[PDB]
Design a binder for this molecule. Structure first.
Ligand SMILES: *Cc1c(COP(=O)(O)O)cnc(C)c1O
Ligand SMILES: *Cc1c(COP(=O)(O)O)cnc(C)c1O
Lengths: 386, 385
């Protein structure tokens, strides 16, 4: 045998106990861990289809939509974004992008790759879009689709959504919203707000393991995806196939790809947990936990990166890196000494911020206090330039 | 609020006990279940990178490769196939496909979608490709890439691989092989056999949960993917990003997408298990379990769909549907009365076969006895036209 058994693999798997207070992934509550330890069932079994049906109802609840074209993407949040774009956008389609952070930037990248005519509305980290800014782009660029990040987890910004769907429809444009970091943590009403494509991820406020994502499409979006004269560049993400297998159309469920059965157990449990809590209660929990964190951070002498409180994302808080410190020193101090994960910035916000997440079961006073004391220590014991 | 908490979600999760003896997914051994119940760690933590590095070594062992561009794809077997094609193939590229079952048909579909000029070598289910046939395709079509299914789990066929790599390389063609169903169950030597892109999946003989897949690229494949004139149509599957995050290039890892941490625990344990068993021992187990199954099926009067034993895929056996029965009756009887899943056909083998999987820890004479007993009962209780 060219390759002999790797000796590292003959040792038991061991993992450290880490408090994940970054922008994701989040820690798992006991019920979600327990679901992930269950035995397999047939991936096209009646029982699996029931679990899928229940997850669909759970997505319809947390998104606040009655869209029948609602399902799980078998991939991370990026995969759901790519699924939205590859199905909705044909080569040459005008695509307007709220490029105010890494997520808009990734939407630009995907749009470019799949041949769309991409028109970024570029903003610096911390920026957000007004209706007038969006209408100017809608008027100048005549897009079939607008992408807006709801929770800009790379900058800590909460993008208002009211009226954007209506405005987009007046220009015959579809509204696609990224709610990966916002879902569960802040108000979101898919149908009410006129959103045509809404997606989120498993590992943020829902506290499920990463690797699955949630997506829903309005009838307007469905029409565009089913009317195109080219096939999408992806088979794995082809919505006609996925809609069928997820029981959204008029035909028997056909084999497309094997869904991640065990991850669906855990995703289903994560949707049950928030259905038990109640959406509005969850919003309150995150709203109150973030207010408390904001106070404790400012009492340390730290400056919140988003200056307008109304624009602050409860689930991911950006903090200006204090003068004289290497943000990497602070972040490593906190994990190295306290087994607490926080993060620096990402894309445009790199070097400029620290990012602290309050996600689902982790959005608690106790965790605010732990991260507050960790930063207090890091500020006292990290090197500060002379 | 428009939508109230779903009543069904307020009930507790409850799963039936099923013995999964179809072509996959397979049942999970204790260590893999235990790993699935663990707590999260940072998706970009040093400890996560260690686990990933160990997984990479494990893939290099089960594939028998030293290729540094070896990693996990964050999606099912299909996703690994798509990752291979969207990175290797550029619009206009000639793509020669072994369409002898569903998996070649799927490769055709992906290739068409991404603008390749696709050349299927279409073969009836149960067929396999000779060196002569492929060279005729290489002669005619001058492809940049050949797709061949190793373990054709829709037809039960074990495709010979020796000599195909050397042949493709003479014709400056890359060899892409699907080993989702063969990995761990039958001999496979990526580097020895000159395979340029090799992929498998988590939920076949490895007995990990479905949702991840395994992929490796040779230096020749890397050269193609890294000298494209256009970016791949996929960002999620762009190999330059993926190679970097998986520590395969000479740059520090940068965030691409969040890897499925818990699934990686489980895959790690699945690779540890087969590392503990030994590849050749795994091949032995599957070979002997399949031989036992073939004899028991034949004793029932059932006919094996692949007649040459040398061409039978140990991990997924095709049985010709017995004359006079509705195969759906048999499949239903087996789950309803014996809590065993088997399958009918898929793609070209639809309606023509039953499919019985023998996968990893499930590949046992006990399970052969269980499915044989259940089939015996189905043949005498299912109505016969
Ligand atoms: C975390 C995140 C993503 C990316 O999700 P992945 O699971 O890493 O692919 C996308 N958008 C937002 C707002 C996010 O917070
Ligand atoms: C099961 C299988 C696949 C596809 O795997 P999925 O996880 O269902 O996407 C591809 N090739 C072969 C040979 C398979 O057996």
């Amino acid at each position: 045998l060219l390759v002999t058994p790797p000796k590292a693999l003959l040792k038991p798997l061991s993992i450290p106990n880490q408090l994940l207070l970054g922008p994701g992934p989040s820690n798992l509550p006991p019920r979600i861990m327990a679901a992930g330890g269950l035995q397999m069932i047939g991936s096209m079994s009646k029982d699996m289809y029931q679990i899928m049906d229940e997850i669909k109802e759970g997505i319809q609840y947390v998104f606040q939509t009655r869209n029948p074209l609602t399902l799980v993407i078998s991939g991370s949040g990026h995969c759901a974004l790519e699924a939205a774009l590859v199905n909705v956008l044909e080569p040459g389609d005008s695509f307007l992008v709220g490029a105010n952070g890494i997520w808009g930037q990734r939407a630009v990248d995907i749009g470019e790759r799949i041949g769309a005519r991409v028109h970024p509305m570029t903003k610096d980290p911390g920026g957000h879009y007004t209706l007038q800014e969006v209408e100017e782009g809608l008027a100048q660029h005549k897009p079939v689709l607008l992408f807006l990040t709801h929770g800009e987890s790379s900058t800590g910004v909460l993008q208002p959504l009211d009226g954007f769907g209506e405005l987009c429809h007046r220009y015959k444009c579809l509204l696609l919203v990224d709610s990966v970091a916002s879902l569960g943590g802040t108000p979101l009403y898919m149908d009410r707000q006129g959103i045509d494509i809404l997606y989120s991820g498993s590992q943020k406020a829902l506290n499920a393991p990463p690797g699955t994502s949630l997506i829903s499409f309005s009838d307007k979006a469905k029409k565009k995806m089913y009317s195109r004269k080219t096939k999408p560049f992806s088979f794995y993400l082809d919505i006609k196939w996925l809609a069928n297998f997820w029981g959204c159309d008029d035909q028997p469920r056909m084999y497309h790809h094997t869904i991640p059965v065990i991850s669906l157990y855990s995703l289903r449990e994560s949707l049950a947990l928030i259905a038990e809590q109640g959406l509005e209660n969850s919003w309150r929990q995150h709203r109150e936990a973030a207010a408390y964190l904001h106070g404790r951070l400012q009492a340390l002498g730290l400056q919140l990166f988003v200056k307008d409180p109304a624009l602050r994302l409860p689930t991911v808080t950006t903090v200006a890196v204090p003068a004289g410190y290497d943000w990497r020193d602070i972040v490593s101090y906190v994990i190295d000494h306290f087994d607490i994960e926080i993060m620096g910035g990402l894309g445009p916000s790199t070097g400029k911020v620290l990012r602290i997440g309050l996600l689902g079961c982790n959005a608690t006073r106790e965790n605010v206090d732990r991260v507050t004391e960790a930063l207090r220590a890091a500020l006292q014991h990290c090197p500060k330039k002379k």
